[PDB]
Write a sequence for this structure.
């Protein structure tokens, strides 16, 4: 309810914007349009490159590197929109920048934004 | 426990087990009797969305993009879905392209993209029976309004536009055979249209079956498998036409509302005002109390009636402003109740009327519910 | 085309042979940004960090299509065999400021 | 407002859905995207053909035939959406049917829906 | 609703006088200092809208459609407007076309459509200075991020794409002349890029002017007529670079928030966080109390400070959740305050901060406000 | 094209000559489905009702371009002079169910 209050992760509901892996997500949660936490919906194209962030997991007290890869080639889903920016840097540090449409590498050179997945790619500690 | 929480549990278990995330593109589950499609014409927006929903789980299992006022169809047998759609080279102006796309119903990938020459689609708020499959699933038929009434013939099997059929001043397309469909006419007759590979089609008419001042709604329910066409009027009188023989047979007319209800202001109202369940031979109709010229407003009630006797079987208080109804065509059917204003599909038990689950955030102005009759 | 792909997807780096030709990736840089090899040499990129990286050669460098290598997670490796003398520039797809060059002699 | 109640026209605000000339409007009021009561916004194309309706003017107690010509060749304005249906007939009486995109005759063969104007074309 | 009310009164008079309705296509009033453009990226939708607004009346006077994440520009002299835009052959998939359109600011009709070869636009949430006009209006420059950093040169006079310029790892484009523009680099320098008709540009870097852990926002204010680049950091420190000589001169850094405000958790936040009035030499910044990684959330306050001395002139409590600000560039300017969440532009007196009027229903997620410095 | 237009816009029914070739329009119908005239004759349609109507010849009928006539209000009229033998179909723009032909002999 307080947009300006510090982000508080949970690890009980992936379709909510405070889910701990969504800590620097900008877009829509794929699980709300027939994808899953870490997979793209049918018909969409899976980007290979993305922005990243370290998100803290309240369950085990460790931080993990999330790769925010976009599912592309469809109009925006419009379901479960979220915008978080934990550790998000401006565009001149694109590796950590989340206004960018991270669709590069998707099949068929698809570049339109539909939704974002939140797979873990590493430990951040 | 919600879908999102089960999913968080599973993902937590995966991470505890040290199982790596390896992203891929999912496939939809197999089309079943409880899959429901919701089209969002988005209040006449240049681009639009269709939501593929698992009505049993109340979950979005996929989506299909379309252009300006597209017409969705679904193979009764679950083997494909398609739409007739319209795009422009610069968003909403420049060169117009009308086309049909066929999609694989599990990968949701387009398997045909077939251009319609000379921009022949009728651009109108979405009426399911303005674009229709033949019973064999081989042909798509679509209506052209202007410059003259006509019906387009699209060969889905050979993936090619075939031709336009000149037809009389009639509207809607109700296919009864691989080569025959019916339409409803200005004068209030029905036309039967039988067409070949070449030549004038063969066109015959029934008699005029309603008065000129009895208005038949834009959203009649039509069961191709039963060959039953269920046509409410603005007062809740119901015409029914039996087309199963390949020719039109008018059934005894029924009233969905009582004389007392009519005198007390009850009328049907909404978009997809009427549904028909084939196995149970039942009609569902969205009604409420309204002035006579508020016929497109949402309704808060559904009446259910036997199609043979006209006997009221139920009256459900829906608990939301409902614009559109439909039913699954399986044994204990779901009643789908779509709210354009809430952008939410409400999923009810058809027997009791009880609300079972809902799916929200279905675009900007969702209006059309479509189900396969897989039996 | 001018190159051949040993492995289509990234493989464990522990599976890379000693004295193999290796470009490490760490601190958002290709650690050997100008590599000189011989016709027939196999180059292996290894990501040393949690930040995913790849190699990406535009259309017309290694052949008609661009080679957009797969993203390597930490301690993943990816190889290319260069089958024709020349100079081949590449970058990291999400990180175009990360650039390199394989000079094949 | 009760959506199901009898529609009650007014003659004091063209931007509200109960303005008397909007008795059978379906879409968006052109005055809210830079058109006016009876003119199209810049850049859009003016349909020549439309559905019509007889609308009652409470100011003078006369009914006028309104021509709901669409302004076309733009995406829908999204401002001042309205849907009224006074006297509105189904699609097989297209002359009084309002779900149709009444863009025919627009310059450049524009057929997308932007907004609707409410000009008077005659007395009842 | 006095506008809707004045209109009803005018039309009533026309009818009572028997003046016939003769429908026409309007022209917008001539561009003036109080015209303001509101762009709606619509939360990454495949199609988008721009609203042209008379800020003095609080009235939409026109609209322009665009494609996927377009970049709008407006000539300072009011002679035209343009955008770089992206469309696809099948709504959001198929063949991509990037293009520049120029429009007449009174008929709103496209006067040029210039295709950009090889889809080179940078697809990113909308940053005004990622596509920029040169001061004479004859050239449009746009940024390419991938496969390599580059600036496309588009000749608006000749209506033709010219070429892509290779540049260093730098971002945003601040032109000062037909031939020269500045960018901001990964290492924290500015690059000057000077380019002729042919050949590689001459590139000159300044000193690094901020540390690597001091973060410069994606929406600096740039007054091309003043050559003044106003660049906030996440803490509200403001870098000012004077580019008026076509060489970068660093001005004294100024803090927009007080040391006590900062201790108390005040930071800038939103989208277009900063505006600059050229004739008054004032900076306006969106600020609120907020945690440090909430830098894109809306803010409820605007501080106004003297650009030369850093003196605080005012702090306004805005009364809404404001994502973006800009000012008119005339003598007693308006302060425009756009809410993405309310889809409403609030129009304020910049001197007293009082809300004068608002314009609502501005699309799905409006974010960018542009004005012409005509004077 | 095959015809000329006497008047760009509709005019008053009362301005039609006592002897003119007239097609009345009333009850959502043209008076004849098939009007026979001679080369050089002028046809005048007169709308007799409040519902606006026109005549619309698609592209290729009277020339390369379509000839979409102006909408007539009640008691307004619109003419065309047919300059070549042939048969020319038309419709009313919003009411495609209103169809006629002029046969010019
Ligand atoms: Cu990299
Ligand atoms: Cu007519
Ligand atoms: Na993004
Ligand atoms: Na309409």
């Amino acid at each position: 309810t307080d947009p300006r209050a510090k982000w508080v992760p949970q690890d009980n509901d992936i379709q909510a914007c405070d889910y701990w892996r969504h800590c620097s997500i900008d877009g829509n949660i794929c699980d709300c349009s027939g994808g899953s936490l870490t997979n793209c919906p049918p018909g969409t194209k899976l980007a290979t490159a993305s922005w990243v962030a370290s998100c803290y997991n309240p369950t085990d007290g460790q931080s993990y590197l999330i790769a925010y890869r976009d599912c592309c080639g469809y109009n925006v889903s419009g379901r479960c929109p979220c915008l978080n920016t934990e550790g998000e840097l401006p565009v001149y540090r694109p590796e950590f920048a989340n206004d960018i449409i991270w669709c590069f590498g998707a099949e068929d050179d698809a570049m339109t934004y539909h939704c974002t997945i939140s797979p873990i790619v590493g430990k951040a500690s | 426990e919600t879908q999102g929480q089960a999913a968080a549990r599973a993902a937590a278990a995966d991470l505890a087990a040290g199982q790596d995330d390896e992203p891929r593109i999912l496939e939809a589950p197999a089309p079943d009797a409880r899959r429901v499609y919701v089209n969002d014409p988005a209040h006449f927006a240049a681009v639009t969305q269709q939501f593929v929903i698992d009505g049993e789980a109340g979950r979005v299992i996929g989506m299909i993009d379309g252009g300006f006022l597209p017409n969705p169809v679904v193979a009764d047998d679950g083997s494909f879905i398609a739409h007739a759609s319209t795009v422009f080279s610069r968003i909403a102006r420049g060169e117009r392209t009308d086309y049909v796309e066929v999609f694989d119903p599990v990968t949701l990938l387009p398997t045909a993209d077939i251009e319609l020459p000379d921009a022949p689609r009728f651009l109108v708020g979405t009426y399911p029976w303005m674009t229709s499959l033949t019973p064999d699933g081989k042909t798509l038929l679509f209506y052209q309004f202007s410059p003259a009434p006509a019906v387009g013939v699209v060969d889905l099997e050979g993936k090619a536009f075939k031709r336009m059929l000149d037809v009389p001043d009639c509207y809607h397309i109700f296919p009864t055979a691989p080569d025959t469909f019916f339409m409803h006419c200005r004068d209030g007759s029905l036309a039967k249209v039988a067409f070949g590979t070449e030549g004038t089609p063969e066109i015959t008419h029934t008699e005029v079956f309603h008065p000129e001042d009895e208005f038949l709604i834009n959203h009649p329910a039509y069961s191709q498998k039963a060959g039953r066409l269920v046509w409410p009027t603005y007062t809740g009188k119901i015409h029914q036409i039996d087309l199963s023989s390949g020719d039109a047979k008018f059934l005894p007319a029924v009233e969905a509302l009582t004389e007392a209800e009519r005198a007390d202001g009850w009328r049907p109202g909404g978009w997809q005002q009427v549904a028909y369940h084939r196995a149970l031979d039942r009609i569902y109709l969205l009604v409420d109390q309204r002035d006579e010229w508020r016929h497109k407003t949402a309704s808060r009630f559904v009446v259910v009636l036997d199609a043979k006797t006209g006997e009221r079987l139920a009256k459900f208080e829906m608990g939301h402003e409902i614009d559109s109804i439909n039913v699954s065509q399986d044994e204990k059917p779901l009643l789908y109740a779509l709210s354009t204003g809430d952008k939410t599909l409400y999923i009810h038990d058809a027997e009791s009327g009880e609300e079972l689950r809902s799916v929200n955030q279905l675009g900007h102005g969702p209006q059309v519910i479509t189900t396969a009759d897989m039996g | 085309d001018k190159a051949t792909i040993p492995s289509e997807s990234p493989f464990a780096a522990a599976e890379v042979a000693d004295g193999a030709i290796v470009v490490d990736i760490a601190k958002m840089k290709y650690e050997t940004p100008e590599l000189h090899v011989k016709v027939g040499d196999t180059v292996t990129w290894i990501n040393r960090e949690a930040m995913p990286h790849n190699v990406h050669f535009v259309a017309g460098v290694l052949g008609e299509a661009a080679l957009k290598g797969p993203m390597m997670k930490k301690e993943q490796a990816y190889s290319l065999t260069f089958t024709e003398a020349g100079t081949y520039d590449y970058h990291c797809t999400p990180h175009p400021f990360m650039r390199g060059k394989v000079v094949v002699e």
Remarks:
- The first strand of chain A starts at residue 26 and ends at 28.
- Residues F 53, 92, 95, 98 surround copper (II) ion (ligand 2) (CB under 6 Å).
- The domain at 1-125 of chain A is CATH 2.60.30.10 (Electron Transport Ethylamine Dehydrogenase).
- The beta strands of chain A are 26-28, 45-46, 51-57, 62-68, 70-72, 81-83, 113-116, 120-123.
